[PDB]
Amino acid sequence: DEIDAMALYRAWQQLDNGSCAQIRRVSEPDELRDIPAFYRLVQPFGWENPRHQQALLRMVFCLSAGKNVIRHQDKKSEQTTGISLGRALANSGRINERRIFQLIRADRTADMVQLRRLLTHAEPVLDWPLMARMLTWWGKRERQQLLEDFVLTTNKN
Amino acid sequence: EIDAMALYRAWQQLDNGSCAQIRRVSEPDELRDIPAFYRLVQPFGWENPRHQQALLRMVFCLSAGKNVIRHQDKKSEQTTGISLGRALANSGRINERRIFQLIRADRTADMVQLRRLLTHAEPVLDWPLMARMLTWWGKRERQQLLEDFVLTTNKNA
Amino acid sequence: MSNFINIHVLISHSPSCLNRDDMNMQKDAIFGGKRRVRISSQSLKRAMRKSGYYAQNIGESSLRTIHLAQLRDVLRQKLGERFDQKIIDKTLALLSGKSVDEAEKISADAVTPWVVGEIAWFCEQVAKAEADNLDDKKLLKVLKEDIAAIRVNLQQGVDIALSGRMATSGMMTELGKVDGAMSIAHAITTHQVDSDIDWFTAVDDLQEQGSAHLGTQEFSSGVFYRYANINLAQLQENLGGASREQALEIATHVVHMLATEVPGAKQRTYAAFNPADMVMVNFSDMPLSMANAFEKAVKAKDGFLQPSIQAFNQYWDRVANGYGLNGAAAQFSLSDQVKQMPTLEQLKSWVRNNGEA
Amino acid sequence: MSNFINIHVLISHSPSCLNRDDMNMQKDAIFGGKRRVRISSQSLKRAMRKSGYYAQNIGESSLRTIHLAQLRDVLRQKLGERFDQKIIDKTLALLSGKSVDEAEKISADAVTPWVVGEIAWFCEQVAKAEADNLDDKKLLKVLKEDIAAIRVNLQQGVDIALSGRMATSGMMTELGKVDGAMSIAHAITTHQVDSDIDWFTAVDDLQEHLGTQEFSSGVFYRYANINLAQLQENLGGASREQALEIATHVVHMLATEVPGAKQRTYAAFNPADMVMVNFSDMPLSMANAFEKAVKAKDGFLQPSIQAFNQYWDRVANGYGLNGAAAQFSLSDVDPITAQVKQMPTLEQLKSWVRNNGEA
Amino acid sequence: MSNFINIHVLISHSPSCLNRDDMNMQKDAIFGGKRRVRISSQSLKRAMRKSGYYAQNIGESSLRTIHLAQLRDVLRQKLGERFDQKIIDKTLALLSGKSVDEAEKISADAVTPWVVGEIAWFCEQVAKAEADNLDDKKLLKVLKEDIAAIRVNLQQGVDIALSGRMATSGMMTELGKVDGAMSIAHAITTHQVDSDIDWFTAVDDLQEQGSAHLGTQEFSSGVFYRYANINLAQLQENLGGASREQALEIATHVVHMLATEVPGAKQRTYAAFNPADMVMVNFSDMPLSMANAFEKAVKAKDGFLQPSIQAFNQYWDRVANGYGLNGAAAQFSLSDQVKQMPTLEQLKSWVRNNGE
């Protein structure tokens, strides 16, 4: 029912350099639909179910920042979730607050483009399945929560 | 809407002279320069300008030959029949890059290339579904063609 | 005759930042559920007030301040040839409600508008009152008699005649209440705007800077809808009972300025000196804005300008028919019952002539 | 006489990356709902400021910094033969509002433009004020009385006279506040641009990993104007003709100078294909000629120039612009109607500008 | 005297694939709203640097790498007859900022250019410091006083003198910062190109026929515009203060190479060994490219070449008359105030003689 995020992650990690190269050339999420290698990548992960397509398009798009741009790290046994996207972006020390500002205010499509730029720039360390859920919904609530996590992190750290 | 199987049956029973005369075009609009065309497509609402573009495409593909496109009805189990992309993939005669360069090919470049693929592959398919695809023929129907092709090729291997 | 005059402007700006807030981000507003970029009314006002067109066709502008010491010295300087120093000081005191020492720091209650002409007139009055050893509250009593005589002075302070003034202290509290004759709306864009950001640096000519964090400046371009109306009667009153012709004159200047003046912010580094591409003027018995023409935000097609102009025109047709608005209207446009005007000057003339030339 | 001089430039660049941000991305901007490529006004300014042409026809650039230690040392070396070190140190300390020790690092509030001529002048004043046991406050109030006398020194810092200066510390707050005479806009393309991407590598000569760079070509619209009166004022009261000469050099530089970025690898050393100069009472930009992004036909250049010419026709007729105007262009096709004098060469244009638009 | 030399080349290649990206697609660019085939400036620079002509006429080229271990071995073997091993290893360690063990793999921060002569000179310096118990710090500050004496070594690394060097570590970070003297553009076709696709197979000699699926390779022909300019003053400075004549010499060699050298890519399969059909050189006080001659993409008539040349000539006339370019200019061409040259050698001589 729910999309496997970790599977897709590892899949993207072990992808052949040519396919990765072919996917890395999209400049917009929907362009992934122009690319054979993409469908081959997401076929095992429920692409054929319309419910999961938009979601998958985002996931891959962000991953398409690089083969190891998004470093996944498991959460600690103690805490209930791992590192959030905002927090990681803030932790990188390379992302300026106004970037997030203009991100959460961006139109559809544009936001994902911007996000991917931020990911290449930061090479964040985060709980990937968490980010994946976030991308799965990606609405007002989530954008806001992103900026909040960023702000509070940058505040303490 | 436009009756498909009617147009197909008309094409199957057209006289060989008209048939060969139609095949000879090299671009859909050239069909407008041919009488046999008008007599063929008039019973199916050519007179309504909304339906014209569509018809021009459909016939063009049919113009590959009187028996290049083999219709086959969908099985009662299945909700839809064999789409074009699946058919092409099933042929074993088409190369992925032909399809890729097909969906990235400009109005017009596009139909010519498709007809070449049709003659080459002589596909068995649910014709009215193809007809619908040709009725709309926009970014997502093209992308869907590529999807079906790639995914079928991966499935079958 | 119609009391109200409506001025609509569609003007398109190249990338720029014509107004910002406490975080130096472009001022915005939500309309139709989508973000428009906004140029506030006060900004437009001050733009027109301090313009050179104003200075050459309308006259002197009010002087808004809170530093009665500085104002003291200024007033001494430009009135010293007509009045005694303490006649001046006295007048200042009576109007401000604060004692005019030779202190170098004297604070009013708030930043208020000072028309110099007005103050000169009050200086004549206070001179009189000084000659007859008259008590202040009685001078007040006398002056409350004929307020029009004081408003006649706002012809050397038209900007207050247009935008009004509220009074809180001194005799102004009784004599100074002006209700503005011009209503003016915050400029907003006819389309959704996602603002761009400039990321700049400063190269230090004495050290090869390496890693650095770049400064940010929000900016955007946009097609703005400006709207203002003028209440002719109230202008006439605010000016001391001036003729309709003088009102219409001032109105025409407001049209010009609303069609040409652009706030000054960051213009030295973004240069958005664009004239307006559409100006329509419309006489009416009840003021009405055309903002709702762009509530459904304009989607671009070959730009935002033309689609905006057409949105405008269509809503104008629908409202004119719907509410039966037969009033003189004229439209000036750069692009190929409303009288069309080839040049801005023809429009201006039309307005001067009460809308029938 | 007209107070404002407007400079419009259409200049076409071959594949390049002339301005980028902290993420190696081309600077862009949205106009008419389509993406233009952008070159920031700062970039143009500093490219002009530091150019060779400026060095040969205007003079020495202002020295912009925030490091008062280094500045101290510099000022010593270039002025030492004229003043005691302690007069220099004191002048710097008074202007900056910080204390000039023999401290290794002494930082101002911000990167400020300094002119050595100006600092010298202040050194004289501080010296006579030293000889008269006059106190710093009174010195300040005295100097505040004749500002022009300080603005004359900006003839050795003309760029400041053009782009201005702000101060937040020291006597400069009262004295060194300069209001820029030249307004200049970001350069944007007249058309939509979808940037290309160069995928590159580096070959290791001792063994047997791809990077990326964004680039694009584009037809750019440069705009600037100069406020003659404010220039004259900012130069101490200089003549209208000296003003016009400086404005002329700005025309030249805006039509020929190009930011240095990525140029050694992309070489977009192109000159302008159209330059129009136009005299005016109220400054106006022609950017709106390209609000409707220019569609290509036989290039972007010709249709951009025609679009320009048309808008200028519409705006000039519509707003009744009677002002001296002249246009230099490398193209042959139909220009602006006869109130716009045509110039075969750039130098004829510049002469026409030097001559208040009558030659 | 004029400080800039502008080199313009029009060169027509036959079906080939002279530069491609990580998907083996031809490199392109959009100019004038149309697609042009492109050859990167790095491709051109490296082709020139590694060419035979450069080895015979200019000499040693830099050794760019990131493997300090391997470089250590190479440097030992190449300098071992002038310095003993420890001086070398120490010098390398100083210039790179890494410790030079006897380790198998010693990485620099990035691939950088190394000039062997330069390194040697540093070895002599380090050695003098060795005999005089001079601290490394003091050594550095001694070296920063006379930089030109370091730059005089770039006559055995002229490619660095032309295309610059950036250092981010070791003493090089203060000493190796080199400002390139040659600016060079990407080559772009003067006309639109829609690339062709070669569909190929690989026949198995032991497999009895059968339908295989075919590979693809993008290719195309095209008339390319090449541009570069040389900042003479900067070349002189970069070589330690060499005369103008040595600089005009180097510039001449660059004219030759830019007119004749073609990148080696896919040439064993496509062989586009074509020589330029036009070469013009132009002396100037401000660098200027002529790419805008082809902004309006060149329409074919009797090929792309002649219209391309014509376009070039007209736009040069316009630019010259409009911007008043009093400057030495000369043009060589294989077809029938700009001095014509019948042969490239005469153009080269005209350049060597400062255009007189």
Next chain:
RNA sequence: AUAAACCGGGCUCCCUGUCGGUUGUAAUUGAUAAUGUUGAGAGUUCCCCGCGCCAGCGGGG
């Protein structure tokens, strides 16, 4: 025609001034799209008019 009815929270206000994101970088080496094939047959060609020995001939679309 209800703790209701009657019943404005209302007047005034630039967020302004200063700022190159800059230096360096081959995508490169290998590769048949190949085997097999009459376009044969067949006077229909839709309308008007003239002539005719009603076999057809001719003029105009």
